[PDB]
RNA sequence: CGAUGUCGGCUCGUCGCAUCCUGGGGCUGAAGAAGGUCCCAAGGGUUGGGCUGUUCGCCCAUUAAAGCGGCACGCGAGCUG
RNA sequence: GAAUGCCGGCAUGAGUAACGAUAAAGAGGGUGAGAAUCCCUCUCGCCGUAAGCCCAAGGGUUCCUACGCAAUGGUCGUCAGCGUAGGGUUAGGCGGGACCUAAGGUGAAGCCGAAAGGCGUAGCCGAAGGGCAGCCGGUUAAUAUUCCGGCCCUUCCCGCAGGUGCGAUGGGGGGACGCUCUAGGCUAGGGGGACCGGAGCCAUGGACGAGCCCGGCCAGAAGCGCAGGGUGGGAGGUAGGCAAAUCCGCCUCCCAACAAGCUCUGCGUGGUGGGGAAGCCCGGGUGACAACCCCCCGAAGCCAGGGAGCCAAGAAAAGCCUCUAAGCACAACCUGCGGGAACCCGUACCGCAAACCGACACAGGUGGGCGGGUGCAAGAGCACUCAGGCGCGCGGGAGAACCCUCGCCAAGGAACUCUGCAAGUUGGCCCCGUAACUUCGGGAGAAGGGGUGCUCCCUGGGGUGAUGAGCCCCGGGGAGCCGCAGUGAACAGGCUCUGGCGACUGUUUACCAAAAACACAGCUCUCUGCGAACUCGUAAGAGGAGGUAUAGGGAGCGACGCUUGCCCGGUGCCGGAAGGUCAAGGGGAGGGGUGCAAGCCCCGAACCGAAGCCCCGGUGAACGGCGGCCGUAACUAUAACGGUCCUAAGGUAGCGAAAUUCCUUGUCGGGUAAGUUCCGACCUGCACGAAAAGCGUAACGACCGGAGCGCUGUCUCGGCGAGGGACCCGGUGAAAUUGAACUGGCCGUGAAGAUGCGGCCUACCCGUGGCAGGACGAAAAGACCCCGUGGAGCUUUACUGCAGCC
RNA sequence: GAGCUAGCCCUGGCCAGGGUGAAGCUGGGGUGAGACCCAGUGGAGGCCCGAACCGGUGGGGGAUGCAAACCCCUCGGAUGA
RNA sequence: GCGGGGUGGAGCAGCCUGGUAGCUCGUCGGGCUCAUAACCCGAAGGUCGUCGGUUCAAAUCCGGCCCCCGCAACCA
RNA sequence: CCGAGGGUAGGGCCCGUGACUGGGGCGAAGUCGUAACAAGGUAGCUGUACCGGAAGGUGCGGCUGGAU
RNA sequence: UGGGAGAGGGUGGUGGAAUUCCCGGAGUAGCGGUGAAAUGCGCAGAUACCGGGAGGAACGCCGAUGGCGAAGGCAGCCACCUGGUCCACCCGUGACGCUGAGGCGCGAAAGCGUGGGGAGCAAACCGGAUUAGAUACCCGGGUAGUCCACGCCCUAAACG
């Protein structure tokens, strides 16, 4: 049947994308988070 | 009138539809228009905050004048009588002498040909608009301010009308469409006659879908839901209310008086309504 | 109770005898026939249908007879539900 | 040494299940160390409204070629979407950007919020909507509307010429719109040809034929032709379109008006450039100077902003045109021509799937376009088949039980069972025919029947043409032939009678309930006078609604019909400037502490003092409620009548053993040979009853009852047959489970159901196909029950707070 | 976190074929005029039959599955809420 | 299994709070009437379901037995 | 070919009968009240509507076949 | 041809009296009702009185034993549209007449549907009285309805 990942590059970069994370303050958060805890990437992969 | 269907089908047996007899013109100004934007009963929060709404016919917005007084002395003819959708009431197309071309809602016995106009020296005729203190004691009149250059807020609906009872001071007192007795201002302007489509409410949806079309979603009973989302939530098998009648929300829905008792036009309503 | 699936039906039997029938008897208020009642006897047999989820029961048409109980109220790693 | 411990390793089950659609294979020839599995050929089968083709998501080199086969591939592998390497994606015109706006998002101004932040007009962003200039062929191993070839077009800059009051983010027009139905004329596509071109072909009885087989076009500027779309023209006035305006709007006047003119598209033609089959020779060559014509069918597509009807009344903005404003009129703009300039990103490949989403090369899910022929009434249905694409990545045998999926069955025909569950029967079209009842629509495909192929002959109407031939489409009447059977195959209702419930079409527990539940039009009550009520929010601000009592919120009821009785004492809601109570506060009789005192300080009575509560009324489609005992009639029986206690008032009409009835299978009637169910009745209704509506109701229902006909493998009662498994051989090879095990029966015993204890009995060692009685077999720390001063949801006249309102 | 699912908003797209035959309109009858009746035209509808599409009624299979909801037969809607 | 009840002939007070049985109807006698009902005047009838106890004293308070109507009988 | 008739299916009229049910007629001396006939003790009758154990009552309009 | 009488019919409009309610004033101990009372209303200020408003329905005197209509029925006043009818003159047509099974229309009240309206009155209903009882007569309340529009019903002691 539908299954729940229906990718789309357009929705996974403006839901979970750079810009998105820092527009708000709990975007900014994971950004630091995620840099502190040394992440080789700090958002989603996407080719556009 | 009102018209009428064969059974040919469940629904067509009692579904009565407008007989639009009136209406003289079937596409409306392409310059008195503009886009309505459904909102589906929800607000900048993106919140539904007005219950089963949405999935209606797609509307135009027709721009109504409801001042009048915008185009004192100005004559206009009655270009036309239209259709529209987001009222009761029919409307007609008014060619100002000037060129100006608006849109008033339509009074009863409003032909298509005739003069009309506003202002305190006007004719006490059908279509007419004048401050209420200028109108004669006992003429039906529609379109009224409810204060001076605020635009016109009572009796719009089809069939309506309110009724000049006398005079007091700055004011006059009208009778409301729904009975009460109020002192309005007496330069507020008010169009003679009464609202037209008087048999308006005589129309039968007939079906669901018809209450589909004009953008009302089905209404669920309190009684048919869960205690989590009603008061009258619950029970097993059917039950009674069990408990005064109840809102969603919590309050009493049986004769709770609701309107604020400070109200500062307290002072102006004379006698609570009707019937 | 870190689980022994719980009515009835279906299938498949097996056993007990306080025996429904068939076989052998005594007594009879046993003329004959047909019964009653008790004794011995478990080898075989013990039907089809209407009603009800039913077990049971009632009813129809029969029959030598249409027995009663045990087997985790036999049997859901056999089926039904 | 134990924690259903943790991490790892290795076992058992076991050479066991399985190897992923039952569309299917066989042989010959290659290659190679090795071949059912790779390549080639021939034969066979499978899809063909796809299992073919194009595109968009998403995927990200999977593409093409060479060289490989350890692992990956459910087997094999020489093969591969796998390993290594090399190569491959080319645009002014295709798509997106340097254009426009939609929801929405953002947000100068502004508003709000402890902080973070929340809003917000304009403006900006935002597309699969608007707008915008390329079609046909050739070429590569791999790209092409991109490279090349033919023909054609757009914008920008500059120049030359002619023309004009030029000039805009400002004004106006236009852009610009729904649903259903639909005319004319075209094209896409297809059918046929005795016509044109073409290798060949004559078989096995016949055919050298008007034989067979193959093909008969595509693109194309200007011009022209056919069909359509859009559009009146002049004048005078003018106060409106936030300045101006010659534009637009309004008034008046002359002219013409399903015309014409102007303009704009579609189709046709068109200089020109292309394409070009079968067949047999090795993707190509030939065919070939290929021919490229006529007739018919014909769109849902095009002319398209076409037409009509309807109500539920159907985006915006730019491009474009016109008006003018600063300006400026050596400028500027329009028109024609000419040269020059024209950027960034995508372009490979998969794309109903082995490359996307499902952990898998997973029988599932995935939007758009094309989707050929014939026959069956039509069609995207069904069967076969073209083009194209496949045989589904384990095979070979055997011919048991049993399982699945399928076929047939004597006599019977529901006897099966909770139940006709399941499976039969019926089955399309044409004609004849069709009941109760009804809201006059229906019930209706009611029921029930007859016809259905093929041949010859005669004839009627239409379409294209021409009015005729030809082709094509609706028909009618005679006479015949064949078979068991003519919608001969495939697709394609079993019917009726009668109850309950819900009016109806809809909706629902994604993944155990589709219903009688939810919704529904319709009915009633109630609130709401607009800065409405109500809802979200601390607020600002929204929704309500750019709505205004024929409107909006809340509640119950649930089409329609006929109706909806009595109780206001309790609770609720509504009214009630009296009276009682009532907080802060006002007042301060009168006391107190301290001080030498003036003074400072602390209590403090009566009285005035809101809402609320008390109190007086109203109110049921507000919460709700609607009696008991005793006696009585000239047969008995019963009780119209009466007595008396109590109530706020004692259940009205209608209905009733009911989706409600305990006793109960009540009793009677009907149906049956037989009826705990069913239907009709009665009424001592344990425990109906009138908008948590009462009683009915045509039509409807994958709802639940009861019956009959038809027909049946449901059954008496089973039999045979098909294929896929099971079995055997070669390949690959799991699983839960598992204290260890050398693991029998009885009768006992034992924590009370013993392979394991006692006594007796029986028993050589080890497997294979089978069956499920036991191992209190597996699975899941019982979901019932209790226990825990464990938890969570829900309720209220439990407690105590809070928001909100007063 | 609304790339599943539920509602709404904006903007696009899809619904083979056959059947039934409302209003209206035209003619005719009728009447003082009417209502109204008859035929033709007409093409309405949460209309009927049935693909696509959307569903998920009953049964069978599957149950360490092809699949953590699938497969076969049958069945509902299919211009509309 | 738990609640309430039994008192002139019928229907109900008194019981709680021990001493004192009451109200309507009915019945019986007398009137009015031609006569009956209605109506008017007067009168009779209970020893309190029983047995047992507490008390100086029991319808009254407490135990048991008979009876009478109710409410309950749930999880499997 | 027609054809008595037989068979199948669906209709129409009539007759008999049916748990139960509805009122009607009649029946020597039942129960309840007393509507009507005298102004019948509320003048009566009436068409309709609603209500009530029963006669009946009441509403609206009508009639006199009523007032004395 | 010319005249007359009339509540004949339909539409629109309009007048004053009375009742109820609301507002202001003034005023206090009862009002109301009956056979007599009670319910009810009234110190929360009623009744009675004056002023102001709103609203519905019916038209006093004229008014009659009268008038008109086919019948049911028709009554303030005005205007408009319209029917019947009598008289006159003796002008026109030339028996064109009477009746009328069916049909068609009209048809008091009550009643029904949809919407409006609603002062007074009032089935049902409640209460107070009467009474043995009183599901009545009397009293205090009161819902349909009585009114309008449209559409039904189609009855009568529709009688002279
Ligand atoms: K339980
Ligand atoms: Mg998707
Ligand atoms: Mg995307
Ligand atoms: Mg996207
Ligand atoms: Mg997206
Ligand atoms: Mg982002
Ligand atoms: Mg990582
Ligand atoms: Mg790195
Ligand atoms: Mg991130
Ligand atoms: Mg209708
Ligand atoms: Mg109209
Ligand atoms: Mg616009
Ligand atoms: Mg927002
Ligand atoms: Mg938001
Ligand atoms: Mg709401
Ligand atoms: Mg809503
Ligand atoms: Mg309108
Ligand atoms: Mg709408
Ligand atoms: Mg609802
Ligand atoms: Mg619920
Ligand atoms: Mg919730
Ligand atoms: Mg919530
Ligand atoms: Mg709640
Ligand atoms: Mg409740
Ligand atoms: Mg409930
Ligand atoms: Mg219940
Ligand atoms: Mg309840
Ligand atoms: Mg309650
Ligand atoms: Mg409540
Ligand atoms: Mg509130
Ligand atoms: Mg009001
Ligand atoms: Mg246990
Ligand atoms: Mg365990
Ligand atoms: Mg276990
Ligand atoms: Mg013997
Ligand atoms: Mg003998
Ligand atoms: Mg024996
Ligand atoms: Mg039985
Ligand atoms: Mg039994
Ligand atoms: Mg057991
Ligand atoms: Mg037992
Ligand atoms: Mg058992
Ligand atoms: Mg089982
Ligand atoms: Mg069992
Ligand atoms: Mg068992
Ligand atoms: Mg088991
Ligand atoms: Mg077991
Ligand atoms: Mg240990
Ligand atoms: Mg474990
Ligand atoms: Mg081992
Ligand atoms: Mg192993
Ligand atoms: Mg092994
Ligand atoms: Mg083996
Ligand atoms: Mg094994
Ligand atoms: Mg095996
Ligand atoms: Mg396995
Ligand atoms: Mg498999
Ligand atoms: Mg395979
Ligand atoms: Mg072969
Ligand atoms: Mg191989
Ligand atoms: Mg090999
Ligand atoms: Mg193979
Ligand atoms: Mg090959
Ligand atoms: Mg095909
Ligand atoms: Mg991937
Ligand atoms: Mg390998
Ligand atoms: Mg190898
Ligand atoms: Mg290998
Ligand atoms: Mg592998
Ligand atoms: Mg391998
Ligand atoms: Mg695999
Ligand atoms: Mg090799
Ligand atoms: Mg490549
Ligand atoms: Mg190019
Ligand atoms: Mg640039
Ligand atoms: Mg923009
Ligand atoms: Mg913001
Ligand atoms: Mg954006
Ligand atoms: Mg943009
Ligand atoms: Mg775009
Ligand atoms: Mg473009
Ligand atoms: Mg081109
Ligand atoms: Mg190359
Ligand atoms: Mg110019
Ligand atoms: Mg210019
Ligand atoms: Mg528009
Ligand atoms: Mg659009
Ligand atoms: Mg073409
Ligand atoms: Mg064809
Ligand atoms: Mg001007
Ligand atoms: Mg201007
Ligand atoms: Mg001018
Ligand atoms: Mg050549
Ligand atoms: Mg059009
Ligand atoms: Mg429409
Ligand atoms: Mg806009
Ligand atoms: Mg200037
Ligand atoms: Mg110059
Ligand atoms: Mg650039
Ligand atoms: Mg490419
Ligand atoms: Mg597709
Ligand atoms: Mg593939
Ligand atoms: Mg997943
Ligand atoms: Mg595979
Ligand atoms: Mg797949
Ligand atoms: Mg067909
Ligand atoms: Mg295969
Ligand atoms: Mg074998
Ligand atoms: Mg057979
Ligand atoms: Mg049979
Ligand atoms: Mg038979
Ligand atoms: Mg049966
Ligand atoms: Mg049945
Ligand atoms: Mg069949
Ligand atoms: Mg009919
Ligand atoms: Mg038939
Ligand atoms: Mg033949
Ligand atoms: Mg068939
Ligand atoms: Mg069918
Ligand atoms: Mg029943
Ligand atoms: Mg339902
Ligand atoms: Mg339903
Ligand atoms: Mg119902
Ligand atoms: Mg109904
Ligand atoms: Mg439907
Ligand atoms: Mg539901
Ligand atoms: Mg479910
Ligand atoms: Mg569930
Ligand atoms: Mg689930
Ligand atoms: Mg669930
Ligand atoms: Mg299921
Ligand atoms: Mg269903
Ligand atoms: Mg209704
Ligand atoms: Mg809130
Ligand atoms: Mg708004
Ligand atoms: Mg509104
Ligand atoms: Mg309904
Ligand atoms: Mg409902
Ligand atoms: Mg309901
Ligand atoms: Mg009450
Ligand atoms: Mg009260
Ligand atoms: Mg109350
Ligand atoms: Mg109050
Ligand atoms: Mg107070
Ligand atoms: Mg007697
Ligand atoms: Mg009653
Ligand atoms: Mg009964
Ligand atoms: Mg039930
Ligand atoms: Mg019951
Ligand atoms: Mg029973
Ligand atoms: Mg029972
Ligand atoms: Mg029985
Ligand atoms: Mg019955
Ligand atoms: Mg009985
Ligand atoms: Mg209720
Ligand atoms: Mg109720
Ligand atoms: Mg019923
Ligand atoms: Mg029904
Ligand atoms: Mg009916
Ligand atoms: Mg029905
Ligand atoms: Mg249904
Ligand atoms: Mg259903
Ligand atoms: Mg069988
Ligand atoms: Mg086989
Ligand atoms: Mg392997
Ligand atoms: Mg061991
Ligand atoms: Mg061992
Ligand atoms: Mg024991
Ligand atoms: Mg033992
Ligand atoms: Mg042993
Ligand atoms: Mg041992
Ligand atoms: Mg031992
Ligand atoms: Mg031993
Ligand atoms: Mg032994
Ligand atoms: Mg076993
Ligand atoms: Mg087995
Ligand atoms: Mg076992
Ligand atoms: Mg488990
Ligand atoms: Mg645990
Ligand atoms: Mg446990
Ligand atoms: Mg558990
Ligand atoms: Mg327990
Ligand atoms: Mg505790
Ligand atoms: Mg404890
Ligand atoms: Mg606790
Ligand atoms: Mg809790
Ligand atoms: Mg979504
Ligand atoms: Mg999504
Ligand atoms: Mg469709
Ligand atoms: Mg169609
Ligand atoms: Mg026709
Ligand atoms: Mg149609
Ligand atoms: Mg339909
Ligand atoms: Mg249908
Ligand atoms: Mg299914
Ligand atoms: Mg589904
Ligand atoms: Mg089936
Ligand atoms: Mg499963
Ligand atoms: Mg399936
Ligand atoms: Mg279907
Ligand atoms: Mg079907
Ligand atoms: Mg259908
Ligand atoms: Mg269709
Ligand atoms: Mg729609
Ligand atoms: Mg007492
Ligand atoms: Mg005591
Ligand atoms: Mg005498
Ligand atoms: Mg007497
Ligand atoms: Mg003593
Ligand atoms: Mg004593
Ligand atoms: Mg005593
Ligand atoms: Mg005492
Ligand atoms: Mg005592
Ligand atoms: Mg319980
Ligand atoms: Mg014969
Ligand atoms: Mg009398
Ligand atoms: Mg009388
Ligand atoms: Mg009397
Ligand atoms: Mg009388
Ligand atoms: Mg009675
Ligand atoms: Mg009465
Ligand atoms: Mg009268
Ligand atoms: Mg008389
Ligand atoms: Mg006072
Ligand atoms: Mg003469
Ligand atoms: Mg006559
Ligand atoms: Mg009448
Ligand atoms: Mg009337
Ligand atoms: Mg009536
Ligand atoms: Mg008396
Ligand atoms: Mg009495
Ligand atoms: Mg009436
Ligand atoms: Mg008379």
Same mark, same amino acid.
């Given at each position: 049947m539908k299954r729940t990942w229906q990718p789309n590059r357009r929705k996974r970069a403006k839901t979970h994308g750079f810009r998105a994370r820092m527009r708000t303050p709990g975007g900014r958060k994971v950004l630091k988070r995620r840099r502190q805890k040394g992440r080789w990437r700090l958002t989603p992969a996407v080719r556009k | 009138a009102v018209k009428k269907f064969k059974p040919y089908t469940p629904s067509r047996r009692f579904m009565t539809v407008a &007989? /639009?007899? +009136?209406?003289?013109?079937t596409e409306p100004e392409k310059s008195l228009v503009k886009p309505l934007k459904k909102?589906?009963?929800?607000?900048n929060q993106g919140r539904?905050?007005?219950? /089963?709404?949405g999935g209606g016919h797609k509307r135009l917005y027709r721009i109504i004048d /409801?001042?009048?007084? %915008?185009?004192?002395g100005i004559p206009a003819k009655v270009a036309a009588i239209e259709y529209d959708p987001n009222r009761s009431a029919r409307i007609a197309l008014l060619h100002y002498v000037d060129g100006e071309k608006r849109y008033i809602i339509a009074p009863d016995g409003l032909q298509v040909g005739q003069q009309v106009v506003a202002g305190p &020296?006007? @004719?006490?005729?059908?279509?007419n608009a004048l401050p209420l203190r200028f109108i004669p004691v006992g003429t039906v009149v529609h379109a009224? +301010?409810? +204060?001076?250059?605020?635009?016109?807020?009572?009796?719009?609906?089809?069939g309506t009308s309110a009724q000049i009872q006398g005079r007091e001071g700055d004011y006059v007192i009208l009778r409301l469409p729904s009975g009460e007795l109020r002192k309005v201002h007496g330069e507020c302007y008010a169009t003679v006659g009464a609202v037209g489509?008087? %048999?308006?409410?005589?129309?039968?949806?007939?079906?669901?879908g018809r209450s589909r079309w004009l953008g009302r979603r089905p209404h669920v009973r309190?009684?048919?839901?869960?205690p989590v989302d009603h008061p009258h939530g619950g029970g097993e098998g059917r039950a009674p209310r069990?408990? @005064? @009648?109840?809102?969603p929300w919590g309050?009493?829905?049986?004769?709770l008086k609701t309107r604020?008792?400070?109200? @500062?036009?307290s002072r102006f309503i004379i006698a609570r309504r009707k019937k």
């Open positions: - | &007989d /639009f007899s +009136e209406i003289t013109k909102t589906g009963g929800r607000n539904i905050t007005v219950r /089963f709404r /409801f001042k009048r007084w %915008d185009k004192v &020296d006007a @004719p006490i005729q059908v279509g009224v +301010e409810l +204060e001076p250059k605020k635009g016109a807020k009572l009796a719009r609906a089809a489509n008087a %048999d308006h409410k005589n129309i039968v949806l007939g079906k669901a309190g009684a048919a839901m869960n069990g408990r @005064p @009648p109840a809102s309050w009493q829905t049986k004769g604020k008792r400070r109200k @500062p036009s």
